[PDB]
Each structure stands twice: as structure tokens, then as C-alpha cells.
Nucleic acid binder design. Structure first.
Lengths: 208, 557, 325
RNA sequence: AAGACGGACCAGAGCGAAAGCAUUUGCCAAGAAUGUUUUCAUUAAUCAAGAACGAAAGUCGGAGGUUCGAAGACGAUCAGAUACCGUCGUAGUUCCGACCAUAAACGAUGCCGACUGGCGAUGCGGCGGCGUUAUUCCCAUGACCCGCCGGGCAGCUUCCGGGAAACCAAAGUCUUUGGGUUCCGGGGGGAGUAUGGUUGCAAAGCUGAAACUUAAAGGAAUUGACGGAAGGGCACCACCAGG
């Protein structure tokens, strides 16, 4: 797995999961995400399993790892809370950030304003990124999607359960998934955690 | 009304009350009143008068089931409807015997052997008397103490006890011996909290011009048939071995032996039946009755004035703060232990009626004062710079909670009357204790509780006089080298055969170096010395020096 | 009377102190009726109870008195109880009555002492006790709010004068002495600091002299070393008012000094043999400590405490029979 | 006074085989759901015949006719209106006891049984809750919340699958064709006419053709165009104010 110890959640991670609120989920019944739910709050708010978060945080990184290019890894964030995060994901991982609208046709559409050639897609919310997920399904593209307890799961390959909506739960996973790949391939090597905080991350919060 | 004919519809009109109860939803007001409609419509007699017999058997069953139905704890007027018709059914039964029980005298309308079992319905009539008794048990429990109406409901106990006579007299002792677990206990149930006050009106009313007719020679014997039937069914609780009730009876016999008889028997029967162990397996609400019993042992230790037994019957009780919950009245946040409310609901739906509550302020004045006259001359030996028997966890420690009170003015609390009399006991003046105890327990009505309390006071008069004479001798011991017997007979108001029993036991049992000439009535002591009491105080120290030095080698080897 | 009082908390914290003070008058008219509602049936049940015969009820009196059923009359006892929702709410209001409490410094602090002394002498001495602990806390925590409240405007000095009376009356009448005298001693000590805050007022100190003079009776009843403190504090704080107020009581002051001489030394030997084993030095410390409260820190002896009154020229001023005695 | 009818409350709700059922209250037996270590031991399934029920108008005979109201007629309407319209009104409506047996009795959609997906309600019963509220001195109630169980009403939602599409967890598990049982169609007519049967008091109901006629009829869906369909904008070849 790599260095198995910090790959079994450290309290630095564990607090940040609580700090970004990733453990929380929605209120909706699942049939593909209820495995990733730890428990539910009084009259229903789902505590997700951070074990399921981390173990999918490892393997979806390991899907990106041993691709010799982050250039054919197009990471996707239509949410503005992750647009700083995929900016700081592409700053750290080197992947291809996708902010905002997909502009339908980058994967189809010979005659088009653009064309991209990825291999794996990473998604903040497959409902907010369904237009990537359509053209992921069109031209044989696997897709990692951050899924909460209300997310869609059709055409969704390996899914990391997170709260991943609104809060810093978005920018923590991009802090963590860029952690996990530099943990595997980088100068934060040999499965060491980061020394870079998620304050280079979490989204802008227009300032004073 | 329902149907205007005889017997045949009426049993079906009887069974329709018997059938309609067994539902998840059932009102039972109509079930009661139609039975009275079937009383009057059975104007035929033994074609219908026997129908009333099962109607009165089923009125009470309809009256009883009517009030775990809305509230709660049956209303006592609904219970007095039970009290009316149980009386009325026995009024029928005294005129009845074994008719509509049938037993092939006739069959229609007869035969409680027709469905079913002619004694069992008669036996369940006795179980309807239980239903009169069970709600009255709640009525004695769930009615307020300060409420003067609680006394009004408590007046109906003799009316129940009348039926306890009237059943067993109409019995036909199938019901007696089969229910000798209970029908005998029904005789206990009106005995084991009863009083010597009526026994003073029974036995100590002089039978010279009062108990000359056979009227006071039948009702007073019924007052002591209850103290008879308990001994009559000691030997039947040899048969009816029934350790949930047998151990419970013998403790109530010990009640009768302590209160209703002489407490020498109650001391024996506790030693006799050995009820240290049976109480555990047999329903520890009987342990509450056991703890009620050894309290009442200490009561008749105090009624017989025995101070050690007032301390030693309050050994399973007053070595613990359990005695609050030994009447079942402790609070949940009284400590960090009493949890929870639902178990508190179980214990307090169970326990206890207010006439079954007792005076714990008396019990503390039983427990504290009894060792106050003991331990103070005892500690006056200790506080004479000679101590080896300092007993930890004692009335000494029950004194400590009242001792260190420099602000304490007038004695007003029950412990304050003890602690003031304790200081009066420490002065050696006997008279000063009597101001602090006897008047203040009349002020707090604690003396006002017994008819024997004048003797109990007079017993504790001499226990103050003889023992403060000892603290007179214990405290002023070094300079008393000649001690009178003529003066001390006049001083502490104690006659010579007491004083000879005092002063010899002051010389023999205390082992004071003292010459005595009882012909001359003179005690000659010469203790020698008070500066060598420090030599005794150092031999208090250095003897401990040799022991743990030896114990240093005892553990290590 | 409490849910509406929760409005009366927040609705009448709206600066109509005409309305606030009149409701304090109504806060007595709360209790003025339901004091009498018991007090009618105090007679009227006992009209019926004497009309009832105890001779026929003698086995029920055995069911009463051997049980100690103690036939109280709940006609009173429940009409006794319902003005406690009227009483205790106003005490519970009092700590929250900040920034002026002058409808209550004038009235309610003393109206509590008015209402308490009725119901304490009627039935409720234990409902007195914790309430006086409650009042002392709702004295203290109300001060510990410090939302525009001081003592030096003589706000807390009549709050003292009410609460001191609330202590000293029940103590003398019938109370446990260990507890309410601490409610007096914690009142007297703090308000000695509040007198120190409010530029020592000698007339509540003359009341404190009377609080000593009360205690001189009580410490000839309870503790001679406290009486060694208090009778020495009785006389000189009066002798200050002989100078401060210029008392022209030349028969009384010549006879209060002989009152101050004779009782003051008499401290015999202790009789407590167990208390010597039970660490007398803790007790004499409290005998010292509440004498430090009164300002006569070490409890003075037999003879040298006389000599305080002898060296001071008031022994000359004794009505001369005692002087000869 | 008369006779009529219980609005609103009143719903993707209930019950009832449908046709159906809206004042209260009572009686009467019924039926569903639910729960059920109860019982029967497979008694089950579906259905020609056969039978029940089956709106309405009609009719049979009354009551009834307040109200309305086929007919009916005007007043008005229009080239014509008998119609809509206004007026008056018969039968009818009202209701009883009959026939009638029909309806778009339509959900245009056999039964029963099986299997295949997501959610949130609601009527129901039973259950789970340190759930709330609520009464009596509080429990046990109930109102209600979360959850569950069903059998419901159904809804929403998805390459569940299909379908000509429309749409449909059924209108899926069909060419990879078969759960069982009943019913019905073979392009369009002529025509439910003829013909006979047949009932019904009749009105009419039911069973049920041929000659001849025809290469189209039909269905969805796309696209136009149209509208006395609806919603948008603009021009003095359109208005306004005007000359």
C-alpha cells in the first residue's frame, strides 16, 4: 500500500475530516452510498464512514498514480469552493483543472472551441459535473467522483465519500488527494503526509 | 329492561359481562351496573337468588377491574362499593351455606360445581376479599399523611378486619387451611402493626367491674385470637413452610412477641428461627419487613429500656444510611446512588403506608441516647489519660457530626438534644440531662409516643443517675482518694443495693485500685499519679513502638 | 403566578417604575390574602377539629399519635403553600431587578422580611432557611452582577437591615444556631465591608451593636468567648455612640456598663472530654474566627477582659452597687 | 307552509365487485387492512353455461312536484334557431314498488400467480422510540415526530425493460418466442343492418350476415399551415391625435 501506518488515518487527517466536516452527509436514502455511511444523526443526517473516505482516497489516487502524466488526468470542479482547490490541486499534482462549465464537447465534437485527451476524471460532485459525466460515458473515460449521500452514481467509477459540497470538505479532499499522489509520486515521497496546509487550499472567501 | 324473563337469559346476561372484559378495548362501567340490573330482575329465589351469588361474585370482579382501567389506585368510594358488596356477599353467604355452590342440594339455579369447581369460586370470593384488601393497601399507601382524610379511610380497616373474622367464621375451613398462607396472614394483616394501646384497654383495663359480662370476654379474646392464631399457625407455618410468608410471619410474630407480648420472647425467636438468611431468597421486601422487625426489636429494646440492644438491634439498621429506604422513602438525588425513577416507582408503588411508616427521629433518639449513657463513662475512662479501646465507627462518630459545633446555642434538633444532654452527661450532673432529653422529647412529641414511656423515662432516669455518677468518679479521679457511699447515696439519689451494685462494679469491672469497706460505706482509692499519666501516655506510645517493630519482622518474614 | 411572572420579569422591566413599585405592593397583596386564606382555616378547621371528638377517635388517635400522624390542617397547609409561588418568585426576581432595585430596596427586601416573618412564625422555618441562603446569594450574585448597583447610596445598607433581621429573628425565636448565625455572620462580615464601602454608617452599626446586643443574650446562651467578644463589642460600640450620638442616658449608660462588666468574664472550664479527643483547636479557631469577624480577634479571658472595662473609665461610671459588688 | 338537498368542509383520500357512496345519530349484518408459535389440512386457480348486481333516461303504478326541467312554446337570436339565449313549462327530476340491463358502465387497459428500481407522502393496522405534546397525582391514552411492517390510494423519479411512437417497474422478464385460466380481432365498409333467435309492458336489449364497395382505412410522432385557441413584439403601406 506504501507506508501502511499514515495510510491508516492519522489524527492530523482525522481532525481535518472533522474540521472540514467531511464526515457529515445529506439526509437522502442511498443504495450505493449507504455502505459508505458510518451512522445517521437524530431524525437523519448521515455520518459517512471516513474509513470508506480514506480507502477510496488511497485507491483513486492509485488510479492516478502510475499514469506517467497528470496531463491526461482532467480534474473537474464546477463548484467555486473547489476551483481554488483544483487550482491548488493542479499546483500540487499537476493535473488538468476544469473549473465551471464543461462546455459540452471537449471529448466529442471534432469541430469545437476545444478538445481534451484525458485518461481519468476527478469530480467534486457528479450531479454538478454530469456534463463531464456524459462525455465521460461517450468516449470511454473512467471518472473518479467525490460523492456525498445524495450524489448520483450512474457511470461513476471509484467514488470517495465526502461531504464535498459547500464547506471546506471540498478543498480538504483536493488537499488530501494531492497529498496522496505526492505521497506516492513527488517530493513528499515514501508515503509521508504533507507539510503544506489546506490554507494554500480552501476557497477564496473574498477578503479584506 | 334487557329481557323480562327468568334464569335462562340471565346467565347469558351474566356471562356477557364475563366475556366482554377480555378485549384490548373494554369499558367496565356498564359491566357493573347491569349486574345490579340482574340482581333486581332475578326476583325469583334460588332460581335467581343463587344468580345474585355469582353476580356478587362478579360485581367485585367488575368493580375491581374497573380501576386499573382509568385511575389508578382505585377510588376509595369504588373500593367502598367493593367493601359494601363483599360484606353483602358474606351477608348472603352466612345465610347461604353451600346453596348455589349447589353440591347437588339442587342444581338450577345452583351448583358452583357447574362451571367450575364449587370451592374455587368460593375460594375466589376470598380472592375478591384480596381485591378489597389490595386497593385498601394502596389506599393506606397512596393517601397523604398530613391529610386528615387519610385517617378517615384508615377507619375502614376494622370493617375489612370484620370480614376477616366473617370469612373465617363462615369458613367452612376448606378456605382456611388451603389459604393458610393467606387466611392466616389475613389475621396477621390486622395484627402486625397493631398496638399495645388497645391491649392496655384490653388487658390493663381491670376485669373487676368492666369485663364481667361475656361481651368483654369475647371481643377482647378476638383481639388476642390474632395473637393466638399467630402461635396457632406458628405450628401451621411449620406445615405451611412458605418461607416467603413463614419467615415473614415469624418476624411479625416477633413483632407480637416484642410489642403484643414480652420482648424476652422476641429476643429468643430471632435467635430461634435464624432469619438472617431466609430473608434474602424470600422476597427482599420481606427484608424491609425484617428491617421493620429489628427496628421494632430496638423499639422494645427501648420500651424495655435496654440501651445495648437498642444499639444492637440498630446494628443491621444503624450502621448504614439504608434506614431511610428501609421504609422505602429515600430520594433519587439524595445521594449519587439512588437510580432510577422507574425503580423508584416500583419501590414506592410497593412501599409503604404512612401508618406503616415509623418515627425515625425517635429511632435516632433511640440510637444516640442509648450509647450516650454507655459510651460517655466509657470514654471518660478513655479521656482520663488511659485509653486502649478507642472504637472507630461508633456513636463516637455519630457524635462527631454534632460535636464540632461552636455556634450551637439552644438544643432544638434531635441530635442537639442528645449533644446537649451529652455535655450534661459529661458534667456528671444527672439532673441536667433530664432537662435536655425528657422535656425536649415531649416538645418534639418523641416521649409522647409510648404508653410505656413513663417507665422508659424512669428507666433512663437511673441510667443517667448511675452513669453520670461514674463520670463524676471518672473525671474527678486523681484527688478522690476517699470516696463516700453515704454522700453518693444522697447526692445522685441512688439507694445502696444499687450503689453497692454500682460501686463494686465501679471497683471490680472498671478495675480501679480502690479499697472498700461496705460496712463503713467508704471507698478508698489513691490512683497515683497524674504526672505519671504521662508515663501512661508514653506507655501508650512506646508499646506501639514495640508492636510495629515486631510487625516489621512479621510481614518481612 | 410564575409564567405570568416571567412576563412580569420582562414586561415590567420597561421603566414604568410606577408599575414596578405598584406590583411590589401587589406582590404583598399576592401574599396578604393567602396568608389569611390559611389563617381563616387555622381557626376554622380547628373549629371543626374541636367540634370533632377525640374520645371516639382515640384508636384513630393511636393511628394518629403513635404513628405521629400530627393532625395538621391541609386547608391551611395548601393555602399556606400557594403564596410561596407568590413569595419566592419575588425573591427570585430580586437578583434580576438590577440597575435601580429601589422599588424593592424600599419595599421588597423589607417586604420579604415582612412576608417571611409571617410564614416562618406560621409554619415554614425550613422554607425560611434555604430562602435566606437564597436571598444572601441573591444579595451577593446581584452585587456580583454589578449592573449599576452600589452600596454607598444606601442601597445595600437597608438590604442589610432587612436580611440581618431575617437572620437574627428566627435564630432567637427557634432555629438551629450553627447555620443561620453563619447566615448572620456572613451577613455581618460582608456588610462590615459594605459599611466600609458605604463610609461606615454608625446607626446601622448601632443596629450592628444591637445585632451584637442580641448576640450577647445569645452568647450567654451559646458561647462565652463569643460573649467575650460581643459584650466587649456591645459596650464600646455603644460607648462610641455615647461620643458619636452623645447619648444622654446617664441612668441606663451607668447601668449598661454594669451590664457590660458582670457578664463579660465568666468563662468556666470546658466539660467536653470527647471534644479534646475530637480536636478542640478547630473549635477554638472558630471561636477565634467569628471574633475576628466582630473585630475582637482573640477571644478575651476572664480577668483581663474585666480590666479592659476597668482601665477604661466606665467602671467609675457604674451605678455603684455593682461597683461595690 | 311546501317539497328538495346536505354544500363549503371534500383529497390523486376512504370504503364498496363494479354500477357507487357526502347532515347528524341510531340499528343491522357485512367487507378490507393489520396483528396472530390459533385452527382446517391444500380444501387451491381461472372461468363457457348459469347467476347476482348494474348509472341514466325511458316505461309500469302511485306519491311527489319545492326546485328545476327532453318535450313544448314564446321573448330574443340568426339568412334559417326549432337551439344557445330570456320566459314559462310537460313528462321527468322527487321517491316507492316494478320492468329496462344500457352507458365513453372508460383506465379506451382480463383474471390470478411469479419475477425485475429509486424516492417522498397519505388513508389503515400492528410495531420500534432516554421522540414531543397531552390528563388525573402522573402512568397506561390520544394528537403528533422519527422509524418499521404490511395491504392500500397513488404519486414522483431512472437506457427496469418494452413499445410504431405516444408512453409504460408495466403496456418488463418475447424470436433467447410457453405461469395458469378466460375473453376477443384478422384491411376498410355495407352492418349489429338484413335474417332468424331472443328478452322486455313497451321503449328497446341481446345473438348475429350477404350481395356490393375498396387500396387504402387506421395509429403515434415530425413538420408546416390554420384558429370566432392562447401568450409575445413592430410599421401613419396600422391605428391614435391629426392634416
Amino acid at each position: 500500500s506504501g507506508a501502511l501506518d499514515v495510510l491508516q488515518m492519522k489524527e492530523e487527517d482525522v481532525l481535518k475530516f472533522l474540521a472540514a466536516g467531511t464526515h457529515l452527509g445529506g439526509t437522502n436514502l442511498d443504495f450505493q452510498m449507504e455502505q459508505y455511511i458510518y451512522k445517521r444523526k437524530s431524525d437523519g443526517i448521515y455520518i459517512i464512514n471516513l474509513k470508506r473516505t480514506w480507502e477510496k482516497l488511497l485507491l483513486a489516487a492509485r488510479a492516478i498514480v502510475a499514469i506517467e502524466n497528470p496531463a491526461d488526468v482532467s480534474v473537474i470542479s464546477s463548484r467555486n469552493t473547489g476551483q481554488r482547490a483544483v487550482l491548488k490541486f493542479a499546483a500540487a499534482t499537476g493535473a488538468t483543472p476544469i473549473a465551471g462549465r464543461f462546455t459540452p464537447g471537449t471529448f466529442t465534437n471534432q469541430i469545437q472551441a476545444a478538445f481534451r485527451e484525458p485518461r481519468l476524471l476527478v469530480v467534486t460532485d457528479p450531479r454538478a459535473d454530469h456534463q463531464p459525466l456524459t462525455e465521460a460515458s461517450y468516449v470511454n473515460l473512467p471518472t473518479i467522483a467525490l460523492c456525498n449521500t445524495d450524489s448520483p452514481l450512474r457511470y461513476v467509477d471509484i467514488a470517495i465519500p465526502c461531504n464535498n459540497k459547500g464547506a471546506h470538505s471540498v478543498g480538504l479532499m483536493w488537499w488530501m488527494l494531492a497529498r496522496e499522489v505526492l505521497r506516492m509520486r513527488g517530493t513528499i515521497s515514501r508515503e509521508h503526509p504533507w507539510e503544506v496546509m489546506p490554507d494554500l487550499y480552501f476557497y477564496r472567501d473574498p477578503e479584506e | 329492561k334487557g329481557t323480562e324473563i327468568t334464569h335462562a337469559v340471565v346467565i347469558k346476561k351474566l356471562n356477557e359481562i364475563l366475556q366482554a372484559r377480555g378485549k384490548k378495548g373494554t369499558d367496565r362501567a356498564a359491566q357493573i351496573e347491569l349486574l345490579q340490573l340482574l340482581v333486581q330482575i332475578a326476583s325469583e329465589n334460588n332460581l335467581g337468588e343463587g344468580v345474585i351469588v355469582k353476580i356478587k361474585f362478579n360485581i367485585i370482579a367488575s368493580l375491581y377491574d374497573y380501576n386499573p382501567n382509568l385511575a389508578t389506585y382505585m377510588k376509595p368510594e369504588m373500593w367502598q362499593k367493593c367493601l359494601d358488596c363483599i360484606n353483602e356477599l358474606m351477608d348472603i353467604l352466612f345465610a347461604n351455606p353451600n346453596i348455589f355452590v349447589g353440591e347437588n342440594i339442587l342444581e338450577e339455579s345452583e351448583n358452583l360445581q357447574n362451571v367450575d369447581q364449587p370451592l374455587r369460586v368460593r375460594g375466589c370470593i376470598l380472592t375478591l376479599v384480596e381485591r378489597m384488601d389490595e386497593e385498601f393497601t394502596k389506599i393506606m399507601q397512596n393517601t397523604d399523611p398530613h391529610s386528615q382524610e387519610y385517617v378517615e379511610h384508615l377507619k375502614d380497616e376494622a370493617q375489612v378486619c370484620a370480614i376477616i373474622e366473617r370469612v373465617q367464621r363462615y369458613l367452612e375451613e376448606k378456605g382456611t387451611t388451603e389459604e393458610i398462607c393467606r387466611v392466616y396472614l389475613r389475621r396477621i394483616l390486622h395484627t402486625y402493626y397493631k398496638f399495645d394501646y388497645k391491649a392496655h384497654q384490653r388487658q390493663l383495663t381491670p376485669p373487676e367491674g368492666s369485663s364481667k359480662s361475656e361481651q368483654d370476654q369475647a371481643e377482647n379474646e378476638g383481639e388476642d385470637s390474632a395473637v393466638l392464631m399467630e402461635r396457632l399457625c406458628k405450628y401451621i407455618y411449620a406445615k405451611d413452610r412458605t418461607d416467603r410468608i413463614r419467615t415473614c410471619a415469624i418476624l411479625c410474630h416477633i413483632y407480637h412477641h416484642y410489642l403484643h407480648s414480652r420482648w424476652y420472647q422476641a429476643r429468643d425467636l430471632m435467635l430461634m428461627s435464624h432469619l438472617q438468611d431466609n430473608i434474602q431468597h424470600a422476597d427482599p421486601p420481606v427484608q424491609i419487613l425484617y428491617n421493620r422487625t429489628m427496628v421494632q426489636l430496638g423499639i422494645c429494646a427501648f420500651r424495655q429500656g435496654l440501651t445495648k440492644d437498642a444499639h444492637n438491634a440498630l446494628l443491621d439498621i444503624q450502621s448504614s444510611g439504608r434506614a431511610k429506604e428501609l421504609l422505602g422513602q429515600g430520594l433519587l438525588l439524595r445521594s449519587l446512588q439512588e437510580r432510577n425513577q422507574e425503580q423508584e416507582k416500583v419501590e414506592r408503588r410497593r412501599q409503604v403506608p404512612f401508618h406503616l411508616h415509623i418515627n425515625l427521629e425517635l429511632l435516632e433518639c433511640v440510637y444516640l441516647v442509648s450509647a450516650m449513657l454507655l459510651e460517655i463513662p466509657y470514654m471518660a475512662a478513655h479521656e482520663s489519660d488511659a485509653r486502649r479501646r478507642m472504637i472507630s465507627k461508633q456513636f463516637h462518630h455519630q457524635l462527631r457530626v454534632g460535636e464540632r459545633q461552636p455556634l450551637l446555642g439552644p438544643p432544638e434538633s434531635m441530635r442537639e438534644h442528645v449533644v446537649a444532654a451529652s455535655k450534661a452527661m459529661k458534667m456528671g450532673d444527672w439532673k441536667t440531662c433530664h432537662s435536655f432529653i425528657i422535656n425536649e422529647k415531649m416538645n418534639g412529641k418523641v416521649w409522647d409516643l409510648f404508653p410505656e414511656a413513663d417507665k422508659v423515662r424512669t428507666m433512663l432516669v437511673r441510667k443517667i443517675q448511675e452513669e453520670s455518677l461514674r463520670t463524676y468518679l471518672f473525671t474527678y479521679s486523681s484527688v478522690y482518694d476517699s470516696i463516700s457511699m453515704e454522700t453518693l447515696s444522697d447526692m445522685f439519689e441512688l439507694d445502696l443495693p444499687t450503689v453497692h451494685s454500682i460501686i463494686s462494679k465501679m471497683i471490680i469491672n472498671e478495675e480501679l485500685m480502690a479499697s472498700l469497706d461496705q460496712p463503713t460505706q467508704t471507698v478508698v482509692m489513691h490512683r497515683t499519679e497524674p504526672t505519671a499519666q504521662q508515663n501512661l501516655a508514653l506507655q501508650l506510645a512506646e508499646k506501639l513502638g514495640s508492636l510495629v517493630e515486631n510487625n516489621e519482622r512479621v510481614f518481612d518474614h | 403566578l410564575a409564567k405570568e411572572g416571567l412576563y412580569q420579569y420582562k414586561n415590567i422591566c420597561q421603566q414604568v417604575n410606577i408599575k414596578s413599585l405598584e406590583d411590589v405592593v401587589r406582590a404583598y397583596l399576592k401574599l396578604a390574602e393567602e396568608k389569611t386564606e390559611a389563617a381563616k382555616e387555622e381557626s376554622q378547621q380547628m373549629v371543626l377539629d374541636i367540634e370533632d371528638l377525640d374520645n371516639i377517635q382515640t384508636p384513630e388517635s393511636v393511628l394518629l399519635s403513635a404513628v405521629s400522624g400530627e393532625d395538621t390542617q391541609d386547608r391551611t397547609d395548601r393555602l399556606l403553600l400557594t403564596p410561596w409561588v407568590k413569595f419566592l418568585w419575588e425573591s427570585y426576581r430580586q437578583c434580576l431587578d438590577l440597575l435601580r432595585n429601589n422599588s424593592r430596596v424600599e419595599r421588597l427586601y423589607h417586604d420579604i422580611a415582612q412576608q417571611a416573618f409571617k410564614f416562618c412564625l406560621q409554619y415554614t422555618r425550613k422554607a425560611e432557611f434555604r430562602k435566606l441562603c437564597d436571598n444572601l446569594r441573591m444579595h451577593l450574585s446581584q452585587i456580583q452582577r454589578h449592573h449599576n448597583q452600589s452600596t454607598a447610596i444606601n442601597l445595600n445598607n437597608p438590604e442589610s437591615q432587612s436580611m440581618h433581621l431575617e437572620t437574627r429573628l428566627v435564630q432567637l425565636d427557634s432555629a438551629i444556631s450553627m447555620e443561620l448565625w453563619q447566615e448572620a455572620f456572613k451577613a455581618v462580615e460582608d456588610i462590615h465591608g459594605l459599611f466600609s464601602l458605604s463610609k461606615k454608617p454608625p446607626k446601622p452599626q448601632l443596629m450592628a451593636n444591637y445585632y451584637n446586643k442580641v448576640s450577647t443574650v445569645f452568647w450567654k446562651s451559646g458561647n462565652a468567648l463569643f460573649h467575650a467578644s460581643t459584650l466587649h463589642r456591645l459596650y464600646h460600640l455603644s460607648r462610641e455612640m455615647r461620643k458619636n450620638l452623645t447619648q444622654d442616658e446617664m441612668q441606663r449608660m451607668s447601668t449598661r456598663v454594669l451590664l457590660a462588666t458582670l457578664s463579660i468574664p465568666i468563662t468556666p472550664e470546658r466539660t467536653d472530654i470527647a471534644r479534646l479527643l475530637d480536636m478542640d483547636g478547630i473549635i477554638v479557631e472558630k471561636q477565634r474566627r467569628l471574633a475576628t469577624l466582630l473585630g475582637l480577634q482573640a477571644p478575651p479571658t476572664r480577668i483581663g477582659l474585666i480590666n479592659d472595662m476597668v482601665r477604661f473609665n466606665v467602671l467609675q461610671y457604674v451605678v455603684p452597687e455593682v461597683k461595690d459588688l
